[PDB]
Amino acid sequence: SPPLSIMGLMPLTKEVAKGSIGRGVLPAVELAIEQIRNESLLRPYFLDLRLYDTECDNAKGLKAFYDAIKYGPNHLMVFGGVCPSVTSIIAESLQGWNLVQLSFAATTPVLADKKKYPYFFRTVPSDNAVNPAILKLLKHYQWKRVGTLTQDVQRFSEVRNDLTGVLYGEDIEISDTESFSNDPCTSVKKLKGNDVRIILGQFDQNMAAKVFCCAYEENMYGSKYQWIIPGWYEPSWWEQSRCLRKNLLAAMEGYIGVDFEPLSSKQIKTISGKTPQQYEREYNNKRSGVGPSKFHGYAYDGIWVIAKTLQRAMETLHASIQDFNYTDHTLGRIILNAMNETNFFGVTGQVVFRNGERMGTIKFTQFQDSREVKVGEYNAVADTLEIINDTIRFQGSEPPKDD
């Protein structure tokens, strides 16, 4: 039984804040590995996943990668890369060791640059993947005029910059573009003055409560307004200076949240023979005391992407692995070509790449009285929107008008 070694790069330490992503996905990884070994899918071989803790640090993460190449076995590909600056360092250098990388948690749009990161792939949609989804939502509700509210932090300005390109050549006008660093109130007053009705917001959880505070003060809420903001905030994030809690909840009422869909809602069997609901029960039993991670499905589908890629690669070699060392450019190209062929239904839906980027599912939520409730989903492959009937609601007789 020869090994097909894979370099697992992720923060695993309890000390490191992002170690929760690494540990939270490991039960899902274990489940996929166990099944692939049982079914003898990789027969004669077996998937050998070696884990190296990157600690979410540029220097430590580089040394972890360097140490894995020096002392570790001959890895065929990289699995992981969570933290944006460490992942970019590794992802940029990949070709030097002819190593294809598959991440399940790095969402930074920067990585979509295939001139800089040609050997990098990811099962998780990037932070920009929300923009083709929002376009569909605007088209659906006939919102042709929008305003934007962005925090001057790279994570958010990347998203706002991508929005320009998505709305170009569509019947949608960005009538007002407003930025803020520490306080949104000045920008929120300008949006009110320019008579903006549909606001596309890109800011962190801390800034969101300030945004909705200014919104209440400037009456930028109710039947006339639609706030479309991030959907990845902590639940009860608003509970955690001048506005009251009841006044924040009043301004928040009806906001639409946008984020990737953690797992498929379709009760259809996946590549493993389990529906997403069955896998989720299997994951929750296996995780035990370890806290759950929203990237667990992306990590699970990730292992299947690697196993299926290795299968295709093995067939390509037979059409004409042990000797591969980072020197074999040709095998790296074979693995790279095999990964680009990925097309199967996984626990996060259909797993397909478009230039290393995941074509996935985007979840739409709406804040209703006390929490965010699912109101729809966008399918990136088909470019379609499905709005759940009798969930989404507007304070007025009709959805708001854009002017």
Add this chain to the structure above:
Amino acid sequence: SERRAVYIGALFPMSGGWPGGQACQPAVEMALEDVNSRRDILPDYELKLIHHDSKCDPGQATKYLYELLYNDPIKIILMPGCSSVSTLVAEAARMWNLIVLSYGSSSPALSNRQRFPTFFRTHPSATLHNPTRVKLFEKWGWKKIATIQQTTEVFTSTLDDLEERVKEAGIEITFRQSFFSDPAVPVKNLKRQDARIIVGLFYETEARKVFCEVYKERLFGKKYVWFLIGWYADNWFKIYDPSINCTVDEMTEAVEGHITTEIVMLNPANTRSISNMTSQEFVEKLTKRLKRHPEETGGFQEAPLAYDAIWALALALNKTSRLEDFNYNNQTITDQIYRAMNSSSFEGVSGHVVFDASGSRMAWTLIEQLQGGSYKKIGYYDSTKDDLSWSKTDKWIGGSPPADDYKDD
């Protein structure tokens, strides 16, 4: 009795954004020969070089950084060129307890001791233009300055430093405008806001676009003074660019009288440095080694910094003198060379070499003015000793510099 080999791990960018390695590698080869042939510097040790071509790419350099650290022999210092490559190796270096010495990095971000605890550079930070700027403002009695930059991290960082430096001198920044590629709207705003003293930071392609727009808006004349980086090609404003409407005569008009600051990279003086060479002798010696002519070969103007980097290290190692026992897992020797590097003070081919608290090189700046489509040397400024050499070569339309204010027109 037995001379022991001590190794430098270097990265030379032979291609990329700054192909500085083309003239910097031979300059390094010459400096090592010069240090090794002198029995009064490291008599007990022989300084040897192990190098790779980084191609001025962090991704590419990551491969060679591995090759330098995970292959025998043990290296005692790391020497990168490009700012992007130095950011990568200087941040990573603490994991192998290594001093990093750059011969070609100008990025202001590289003067951060939290991110880069063991970093030094013989190439000064781009922020070295800022004390000369504040000094020229103080000389001509201006307290109101407008700034225009192209959208690049290095320019943003340089303007960020200029802010805290003008505040110390009782000078304020009136207006700050930026552009990614097209400077039409930021220059139109400079006219609208009636800006007189303007600092503009951009590359050559963008400079032609700025000054074409500057002609169209009549943003030049007696009323205005432009402060640019003196790093452009010889008749940059005369260079043909089909993207600009303006003519050669029209932009020779728009650029008339502007001031430039440039980092001094070769001692203008005819003195002899520690190698006992003159600035002129170094150039002649260097020209001989090269396959191609100085104009063709990249990093020729920065080559004295690479030569001086080798001497800075040799003298630092001379001050410490147990070098064979260096290990990547031990801070002891590193902390000693850091202290010796931090205390550097010697005359090199590029001038007097000293480092600030950040590990960034302190040097003279050359101040010039464009008089009749040609740059004329109007002086030099020394940030550390606060001394300005004035040529009395400056010229102005009204016989004297204008003013920032609406007041004298």
